[PDB]
Amino acid sequence: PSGFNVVIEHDSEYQPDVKVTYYKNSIGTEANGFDTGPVFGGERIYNLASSLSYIRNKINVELPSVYAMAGEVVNNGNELLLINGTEIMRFVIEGATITKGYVEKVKPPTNLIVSDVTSTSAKISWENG
Template identity: 35%
Template sequence: MAEDLLDWLNDKKTFAAKVEYRDETPTPDLTIQSSSDLLNKAQANADQLSNKMYGKDVRKSLAQWILLGGYIYNQGIITLGQFQAALNSFEDVMKDRQVDVEKRQTNVEDKFRNVIANATVDSELIDARNSTIYGKFPTLDGRLENIEQMLAMAIPSGYLVTINHGLGRNPDVTVSYYEDAIGTEVGGLGKAAIFGGTNAKFLESTASYVDANTVKIELPAGFALVGYPVYQPADRCWYIIDGNRILKFDMGVKAGDHPNAGDQSEL
């Protein structure tokens, strides 16, 4: 109905009907049977305003024109409300489906692990699943994955950052990691779980010096970010910012130093 009404209004933007005040018949009462009848009633109302001879009939036609406008406006609000309700319902359905899919996926993975666990008969492999520190794992692969995850977050290997610092010496490098600093929160300011960001975590790192102006820093692979180090004069440190995740490289820059603040992207 809304599209039909829009087409009709576009067609009537220029009213070219011949106006003749010769219609002596009274203006009939306005009765709208359905939304599809609206266009016919609007056309009839326009003809009445153009042709009715007597003032009382013109005034009645004007009143009906106001009622028609109110009806159109009301239908628009109802249609918008129906659309919003349908959209909300669709979002609820999709959320429920996502939860169901995740539950089924978890069940499938659990069943798969149980199959592997029950199919293994080698006692040495079965014993290797369990850790006196981290507890029992359903499969040996689960324990190995856990070990790899811990190594990726602790051992300085797998992620190399090169910084052309321009200090003319081999500085000591301290690397820290934190999330959700003000201005980087996912969803906007104040949306993070901890306002102002998480506490800085100092990372194990290995520095190798290409020359007196360039350093290569090896970090745990689990902290790899997308981006290049950028020097910030405010606190004389280099930063890599990837969304809400931040790496800070402190090289002990002093007031008299002249660090390279240029683009590091070519390194």
């Protein structure tokens, strides 16, 4: 929909910052085993532009739809890693500890409309995320 959304659950009662990077063939992600890639340690690191929004204990990292990828989620507490083969999308939190992280699958409803409103009732209608 709006984009590709990665949820980061943390222990802060506030709004931790998140910095997103992307890189291929870092140590342990090479297809033919350790150091079988074209640039040992990892190829070009790209900074990914994110739009962040917050609720208590949950950061929602909205990235452009073009970056959308599958993959294993690794939680290292200081950083979250979205590993898809050779590709890694790295999320670095500031001022909190990552509790759990995941690509948002169950997404919140959207076009909320109040119709047929009377003194005693109203009808709420929406659209799936």
